């Protein structure tokens, strides 16, 4: 037997009389790849592609990560309806709620659940945060500047996974059966078989030196807010929670840059500066299937993972810096485990997520564990927990997600309250910021980022926005620095980006 | 300050002051390179280059890869003489015992004690199982085959850093000052600073792919001992034991095929199928500067490693295969935990490391921990014990690697009456087999892996030796198998490695 | 000084200024006495005497036992309204809600929060089950028949704190200052001392032998239900649960015995053959000051317990037999851990707990931990979890009683629903059973165990409770059987304490 | 079935054709007695009487103590020749070595091995330090002052078991078989019943109050040394130590005072001030069968213990006082682990009692466990571990006692040119100090406890020797209080305990 052996037409024909998705795969030996150097072979950075890669804690590479090849195809949303951008067949559901449509579309494409890496193929993209305007009933006061459609996710049918434990390439092209009969089997197997022989021979290619230097310039930016403007948004809100408003409330502004560096080049320095758990790159497809945007972001939280039935969330609440250095590092989360406030903080947005998956998961099901414990980062240390929940039955994964968004952490307890308060503060809509990137697969599962730490890179501009937690004590001048700083970090490695070369060049 | 900045001719100048090894070092963004893509382009397969790779439990690879650009200069012996393989100046410590020579070179060649990855320079290479010869009196009665030097350590001062989580390269140019005089300091910069331009326009180059697929063809091979010479020489041994000439003793024999196949792919053959905490590649070099004979490994276990004024050792005894699978893998750990007997061996083997590390530690600081615990491998679990020891005042860490050597795992208990039955019972000389492979950096810190799960490649021959240890109730019939299916992992993949091409081709 | 020194008159003034009760103490040593031989001495079985004991998981006694050495007064309940049995002054409140007139008592008698042991002096008694009608409108299908008040707690003002670790006991006098003015002060002073002399020499006193033997003969008794009025009650209550009226309800029946064996006799034999964490003996008296009744029981779980601001709670739920044996007792660990439904049970109680102290607790306080691990006691092993929460602002330890009032372990999940099936399905009211015994401090902490495994005893009658919980798949026999064997550990402890003689006679 | 039933006569002569020691049992229900209550019933201060506690880490006594209710015979040493004190018949070994004696003793009556309390029969006294005179060849410089025989151990086969959990007594009367033949079975029964009797009908009795107070006066008290003497006896001991002499070595010296408390009063108060792990009160008597002397002790540290098999020791080493308070006392604990000198001293103490056990232990069997923790005692904590091994093939509890004998942590490292230095020193002979307190039990097991902390009580003088270690950087006056302070806690319980009266008289 052969590792490359690709999967058998006779197994193919037996798959697709079961599900509309049939994965055909292929396994090759690619220990001279990266994820990135795999990404530059199989996508070259075309409209639709994508890579997503996770550092847990900033520390350690974990097994997978996984590119899009060239998805031809995305469900999305124009003038509040849900459209397909390039060319899908009649059976595939179109116009009216996205969120109907992206439901019947998952609940068409299903397969089973084999040996597959975690992610081999589904539907791959954004919801804005603006997406909560179809969940629960807010204000439209801010406006809205960027104009990004609620959602945008890739049929992503051609997908390499990257086994960093292996060394190998796990080569999948999915047959999208959206018809559901018996007819083309014979064709749809050649057809998935060439985008194999296609994706293998990309990775055939040769591939010249990105071996770099770069340094770190201070970019120069635009931002919305001056510090007496974003000091006074959050004496407000401070006076709201004294009053009982809500408990916390998560305001942002947005700053931007005038940039043409390549999205991949950003991502290149994030990867080296704040690696993170959830990296992504995406290169998102307009109607003419050029590259409309680009997504680049280094996110430290999950919104919600599901996995073989269970619904599964990460709160995140409590800071220090890591310690300069190692005694200071254990004084500092001695102090963090003892500070009364931020526990009740990050108790509030436990009980936040038990509720949202209360909504979806069967009665009984819902736990909280591994409470309030202290998590390292690159550069700070967090208290989080995890909940987690089963699926209610006939729930499903996006349930999960629309159960759960927006994340506590990025919006406040109560939540809409909260989401009411920063409509109040805030100048323009979100767009993407607060809301997540992430895919749903297949076979069930899903994964979303929180959509922080990220740049959205559109016609020679790049938007960087970030906020923080607002409490009753917290103060204007320290709010508005330690958000600007958040958003520097993605400023500071475009401005860095810009300076790759050749070293000695 | 750029990425890659060199080391500046300022700081060059007092570090040469100071100490005899000056590193000069450059580091690089290399994120599309691997540890073998960027082998291929530093080293290119090239006599007295080598690569160390390292995966924990066989599981998650370590933060480090070190490589080694070419050295035209290693310390070895020939006709009972230390000599110099390539040219080295006057005061280069030169004939008579080696290991004294080994001695000098390393008094002379310390450095500073930073910022530095782990391995940065230093003495790179192995000592036959036969340099005990030197260190204890045993009869001669094997016969001595492959005739391989005791020792052979390349001077390896161009070296290359992986460092996988950051994704970067940091590249070391170390200048050796044999003299330790003033003269030709800023000679010795420039020279350094040509290396690190070397090494650096190297990483510029393109490469072409090797993606690839092979498959697992069953290998046609030459065994030394039959399976009744091999369950007659055990009971032999068992017979020994039972009187009490000795605990445990570890025979094993020799197993050979003929290829052509080149060592790098069977290096990328074992990475896949028994990725290991020491993987090495080593091209080592004749008195001529090309490859006399090539030595691939993955081997399980340290002999020792010192860090820091400590040397520390990880006995290895008592094994079951993992789990198949995840309730079997947990009856399989209480039992080899409850295995009054495994136990036993392990605490020998312990007992063996505590005193040898207390023929050069402190008295009252050689410890024990993390006791007779469990480790899961790829395919099996073994106990595993720490034992940590201060180096002694004016004690170095060759005197940690030869107190310890060689590995009770690889001899037995008592250690000498243990050679000396594996003297009686073994056809030949071990040579490499048993022996070690690792470095001893000019910091003063070492690390030495046990060679074994090893091939040493000569003139279109692949030896892999194997073995296992014996006890009181051991089986002759069951000792032979497992011996010769450690050595089929070897061969096993020097027979995939001839398979590797190109899919589909 | 003294090991006996008694509080000075001087440093009483100054307490007496600052609180309405002060506390005169004196320590002695004691380390011929037991828990009992002191209530034997100190109490005498005497109408408002108490002995509390406790076992953590029946396993290892703790290191305090309280007595309380006659309570000539007890705020109650007659024709629904608060009286003081014995007499009080005219501070003291009476009449109306029996909880405002405690609530007022304990607001009035707090004390300074000093050196003293846990209990030291209050309110001591019990709560019925039927004090719930109070809190929630019910249905009043059942017959009281046992007619107790919903209330009765002693005014504890003599207490005899047992330390077993020091061998020494701690005796308590506290001056009770009703109407808060300045008026006896030197009376009250040596009123205390006189109670303090009174208890000294009660302890002087010599005392015969009770070394024992007894027998466990098998009880005749009389039950409310067979097995198949019971067995039906069952099928009725999971046929509700089915449907959706509840996830859980805890029905039982009551059982008799008559006997005229002391109660000690009876608490003696609980606390060989089911120690618990919480024993209790109490002598209940009457208006006329001779005992009414006496209630004995050795309980398994506390409703609550109030210590410096927080109020916690300990929900068990989920039951294995302990092991026969040792290999045995694991398997079945890991069983109970890995039964699904269980863990489903017992979060419902865990999170009903939450929600019981959300109602008193400030918001982002209420948390579990140790959730849901085992505990294995002397016959069986249960899932717990701990639920702690901070007291909201001027809320009181009674307010957590009621709060949490009555266990959802007695009762079931959601609780007012449960509560009306047990209305619906039993024959008499509750009365004690599913109610508390306990303490109230005037320090303001607080501990009341549940009131299982308790029997009244009342004019030469008996009366033994027990009952078990009711889910989806309970089985009518099983549970009956489950119930009566609960009861029978009583009735058991009842005929054997009849047997006690001193050994052959 | 009752609860005191006694042995059968039928089951008794099943196990006396089995063995030459038959133990006839009956358990009591005693919960109005304690330890010390149960002791003054059965053996009232009587010569040959002893009782043995356990405070595990001086908090939380364990489950059983031991009380001997009058051994008519014990085996000692006169002249340097093994002799008993009160009549035993013609088979029991007498004259000669007194451990050999001890050996066949024990040989002899060896029991079964059924549900019996740890100690329900066997040799129970102490060895004196100076036994070790008969295994190591040692100086004769110290006047032997005390002269207490090298041994001596009563045959107590008269032995009351209280069970503090369960409130029980199990009494045991041991049937000693010497001559080994089938005559007087039926006589030896009846004989075994009717001291079960007596113990029975003592237990039976009433009692008196010991109800008490104390203070706590400063003893006067003649001390061998000034602080002066003893400050230079350590530094002379530290020159040894500094030139290599041993690593450690443990000097001390006898304090006294004269008194006649009684010894129960004593053990009264240090049960009290420092309970221990091996509390014990023990009247040795004399030929005439009247108290020779009394031993009160509350040791900290068991020499050995062994129990179905296997041996295990516990060396403690490294101080620091309990934290006065919480924060404090985790600085102290983080700083002890922190302390590499007393962890060095710790580890040399650890490897003593390797060593020691491997004298007896089979080979591969004696592992060190728990190493290096933290134990918290009352006023201090230390750093503690476990050595523990299997006896090997026929060795004997003796022989693993007197592998050991003496604890390490009493003399030093190395152990005998330790006891040679202690033996050029000090003044006079040891004694008891550093002996051990203990018993042999007929089962098979031991436990002994380091005779330190102890008082012996002769003619209306009672002696308290005391000491600590000395290493390279001892200071002499800080050693000298250190031991001075030891010495005072057991001098400052006897004079409180010369206070001890009824509270107000
Ligand atoms: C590291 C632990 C083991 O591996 C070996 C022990 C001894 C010899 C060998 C060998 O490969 O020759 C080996 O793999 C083992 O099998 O116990």
Redesign the interface.
């Known amino acids: ?4 052996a690709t999967t058998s037409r006779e197994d193919f024909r037996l798959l697709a009389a079961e599900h509309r998705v049939v994965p055909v795969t ?1 396994k ?7 994820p ?2 795999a990404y ?1 072979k199989l996508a070259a950075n075309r409209p639709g592609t994508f890579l997503l890669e996770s ?1 847990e804690n900033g ?3 974990s097994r997978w990560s996984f590119i899009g090849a060239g998805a031809p195809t995305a469900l999305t949303v124009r003038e509040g309806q849900a459209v397909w951008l390039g060319a899908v067949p009649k059976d595939a559901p179109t116009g009216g709620d996205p969120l109907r449509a992206l439901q019947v579309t998952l609940e068409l494409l299903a397969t089973a659940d084999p040996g597959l890496p975690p992610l081999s193929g589904g539907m791959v993209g954004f919801f804005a945060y603006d997406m909560v305007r179809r969940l629960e009933r807010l204000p439209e006061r801010a406006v809205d500047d960027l104009c990004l459609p609620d959602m945008l996710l890739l049929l992503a049918t051609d997908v390499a996974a990257v086994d ?6 796990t080569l999948i092209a999915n047959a999208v059966n959206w018809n559901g009969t018996d007819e083309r089997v014979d064709w749809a197997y050649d057809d998935a078989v060439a985008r194999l ?1 296609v994706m ?1 021979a990309a ?14 310039p201070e970019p120069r930016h635009r931002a919305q807010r001056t510090v007496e403007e974003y000091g006074a948004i959050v004496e407000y809100l401070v006076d709201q929670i004294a009053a009982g408003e809500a ?1 916390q409330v998560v305001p942002s502004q947005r700053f931007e840059m005038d940039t043409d560096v390549d999205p991949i080049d950003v991502y ?1 320095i994030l ?2 500066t704040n ?1 993170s758990p959830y990296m992504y790159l995406l290169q998102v497809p307009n109607s003419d299937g050029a590259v409309d945007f680009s997504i680049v972001g280094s996110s430290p939280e999950a919104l919600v993972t599901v996995h073989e039935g269970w619904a599964t969330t990460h709160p995140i609440a409590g800071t220090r810096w890591r310690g300069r250095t190692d005694d200071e590092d254990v004084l500092l989360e001695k102090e963090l485990l003892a500070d009364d406030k931020e526990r ?2 990050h ?2 947005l436990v009980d936040l997520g038990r509720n949202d998956l209360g909504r979806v998961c069967t ?7 591994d ?2 414990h202290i998590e390292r980062y690159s550069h700070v240390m967090h208290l989080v927990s995890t909940v987690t929940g089963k699926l209610g039955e006939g729930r499903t994964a996006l349930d999960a997600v629309t159960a759960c968004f927006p994340a506590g952490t990025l919006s406040g307890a109560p939540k809409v309250r909260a989401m009411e308060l920063i409509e109040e503060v805030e100048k323009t809509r979100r767009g993407l910021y607060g809301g997540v990137v992430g895919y749903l697969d297949f076979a069930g599962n899903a994964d979303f980022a929180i959509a922080i730490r990220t740049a959205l890179m559109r016609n020679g501009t790049a938007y960087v926005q970030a906020g923080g937690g607002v409490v009753a004590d917290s103060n204007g001048s320290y709010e508005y620095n330690e958000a600007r700083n958040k958003a520097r970090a993605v400023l500071n490695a475009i401005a860095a980006a810009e300076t ?1 070369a ?3 060049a």
Chains 1, 2, 3, 4 share one sequence.
């Not at 037997?1 to 490359?4: C, E, K, P, R, S």
């Not at 960093?164 to 390439?169: A, K, S, V």
Request: aromatic share 6%.
């Open positions: 037997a052969d590792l490359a292929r090759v030996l690619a220990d001279s790849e990266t990135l150097s530059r550092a520390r350690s590479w960093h434990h292996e060394g190998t390439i022989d293998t990775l055939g290619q040769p591939l010249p030196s990105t071996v770099a230097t770069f340094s770190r408990f290149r990867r080296v690696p009740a903080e108790l509030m009665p009984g099901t819902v736990r909280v564990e409470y309030s790759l050749a070293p000695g």
